[PDB]
Amino acid sequence: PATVVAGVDLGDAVFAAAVRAGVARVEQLMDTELRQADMSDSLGGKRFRPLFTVLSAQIGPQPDAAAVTVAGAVIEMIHLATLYHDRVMDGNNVAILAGDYLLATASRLVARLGPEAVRIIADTFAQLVTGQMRETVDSIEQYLKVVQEKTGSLIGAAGRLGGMFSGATDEQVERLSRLGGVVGTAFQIARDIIDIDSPGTDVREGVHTLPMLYALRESPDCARLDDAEVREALTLLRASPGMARAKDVLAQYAAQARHELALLPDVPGRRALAALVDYTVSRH
Amino acid sequence: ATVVAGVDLGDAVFAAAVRAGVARVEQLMDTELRQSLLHLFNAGGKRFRPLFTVLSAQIGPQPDAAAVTVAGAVIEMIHLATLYHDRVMDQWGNNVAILAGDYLLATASRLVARLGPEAVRIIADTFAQLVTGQMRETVDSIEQYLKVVQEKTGSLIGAAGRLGGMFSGATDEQVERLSRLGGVVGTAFQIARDIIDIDSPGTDVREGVHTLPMLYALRESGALLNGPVDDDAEVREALTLLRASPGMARAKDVLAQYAAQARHELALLPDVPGRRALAALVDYTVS
């Protein structure tokens, strides 16, 4: 545990403490920027994206710890807001307002990071709405388009901002952006798989995830769209070649993340990010 | 004639320049919003917030700067997004309303981003204010209501004044004055809506929202508005009862006081046509 931050084993406990403190600084800024005179508002609400932002800023030669803290707070507040809005689309009005406040505060914070950061966030918002627009011809191409837009884009921006505000080179910033995009997708696909492999299992009533999408192509019929019906649906998926097909797609994203890792500079942040990748494609 | 949105501005050449500025905002909105998710109504230049932005920009040497139109569009998209998010129920559904609002928001992000980080900060802080206003709506009751309407309605119109001043090139002190004017005008704008909801309807009683006339009434003695009201018979009742309380005359007094506050703010703007137009907009808004 002393080497672990946000579930990622960073191998070294002294290094883990410095990284954990960078994550803690992100949450502390969020708590300070959200708290007003009016509130269990931040409380999946995780440190994954803060971890990713801090680790990405370990790739450049001159991390700006204050700016890195801002970027991570911006990214994660946006993450939480997408969760609030997703719950209502599947109190409603209050959950929407809370998400809107998280989005307003994230936009306020990123203005501190200057004109380039501001455009990166605005473009990320555009992708986020595009994926929600899409999510409402190849149905698996679309599903992977949705998670790339709603999930991969935001972790790409965290990688981008991490590189930018450690003075990484232009090419390393692009690479960190691409890594974060591929990490976000792989993370979701692992989630899809884990929720059928078995902590609750098929806590996914209504959601057509990637294994399911594969299984419904074969040709022997789903009971799909109350408790035995759920277990009866679980056996079919764990059996189906759709499961093995979903793990192949996961492996394609893992392969692409590791391709990007390999061209990162040989610095301790690269090994940290590879452990982040390992955890991402793991059982979480 | 010399009228732009029920408001007589003065000289026909000023009014024409203002009409054209507002129309430019509606056009930019249309253009930037094109991708069926939302259906904008064509108000033909009568939207309050583009008008207040364009009027505020008249104070600057460059009222028709392109950034002024972007500001106005941004302001109005924020206001539209709140209308869509307001419709989330505890359009076709909750999903459309959320998505429509998020689309407006995202489009506003792209536009304000190119205005610069300081304009991003202003709009973001304003939207934050606007949201906590709606949270807070859900001590001193009057100062509490006024804080709510200042947050949920006055801050966006303050921002319109601030942005209009900034990007028309107005002086720093003028930007500040126009921001203060906008907050006071937006409050008076809401107080006037809340009075008009009881004079001649009833939406606030049915919704169970406590507005200025009701809050002053509940200070006397001799409170059925605990929660909302469903039956149309009790609605009619509360209206006539509230129409007779001295709290109704007190809310009108406070409205007149906010008008006087706005006149104090605008009196120290330069002596130009735009000051008179703003003065006229104030008079219209409280009448």
Swiss-Prot record, chain B:
It is an enzyme of class 2 (transferase). Mg(2+) 1 binds at residues 86, 90. Keywords: Lipid biosynthesis, Lipid metabolism, Magnesium, Metal-binding, Transferase. Pathway: Isoprenoid biosynthesis; farnesyl diphosphate biosynthesis; farnesyl diphosphate from geranyl diphosphate and isopentenyl diphosphate; Isoprenoid biosynthesis; geranylgeranyl diphosphate biosynthesis; geranylgeranyl diphosphate from farnesyl diphosphate and isopentenyl diphosphate: step 1/1. Coiled coil: none annotated. GO terms for cellular component: peptidoglycan-based cell wall; plasma membrane. SUPFAM superfamilies: Terpenoid synthases. CDD domains: Trans_IPPS_HT. The record marks 87, 193 as: Important for determining product chain length. GO terms for molecular function: (2E,6E)-farnesyl diphosphate synthase activity; all-trans-nonaprenyl-diphosphate synthase (geranylgeranyl-diphosphate specific) activity; geranylgeranyl diphosphate synthase activity; metal ion binding; prenyltransferase activity. Isopentenyl diphosphate binds at residues 46, 49, 79. Its EC number is 2.5.1.85, 2.5.1.10, 2.5.1.29. GO terms for biological process: geranylgeranyl diphosphate biosynthetic process; isoprenoid biosynthetic process. The keyword Protein biosynthesis does not apply. A motif (DDXXD motif) lies at residues 86-90, 193-197. It catalyses: isopentenyl diphosphate + (2E)-geranyl diphosphate = (2E,6E)-farnesyl diphosphate + diphosphate; isopentenyl diphosphate + (2E,6E)-farnesyl diphosphate = (2E,6E,10E)-geranylgeranyl diphosphate + diphosphate; 5 isopentenyl diphosphate + (2E,6E,10E)-geranylgeranyl diphosphate = all-trans-nonaprenyl diphosphate + 5 diphosphate. Binds 2 Mg(2+) ions per subunit. Its cofactor is Mg(2+). PROSITE patterns: POLYPRENYL_SYNTHASE_2. Mg(2+) 2 binds at residues 86, 90. Catalyzes the sequential condensations of isopentenyl pyrophosphate (IPP) with geranyl diphosphate (GPP) to yield (2E,6E)-farnesyl diphosphate (E,E-FPP), with E,E-FPP to yield geranylgeranyl diphosphate (GGPP) and with GGPP to yield nonaprenyl diphosphate. May also have weak activity with dimethylallyl diphosphate (DMAPP). Belongs to the FPP/GGPP synthase family. Contains the canonical two aspartate-rich DDxxD motifs, designated as FARM (the first aspartate-rich motif) and SARM (the second aspartate-rich motif). The primary role of the FARM and SARM is the chelation of the divalent magnesium ion cofactors that assist substrate binding and catalysis, but it may also play a role in determining product chain length. This is Nonaprenyl diphosphate synthase. It comes from Mycobacterium tuberculosis (strain ATCC 25618 / H37Rv). The lineage of its organism: Bacteria, Bacillati, Actinomycetota, Actinomycetes, Mycobacteriales.
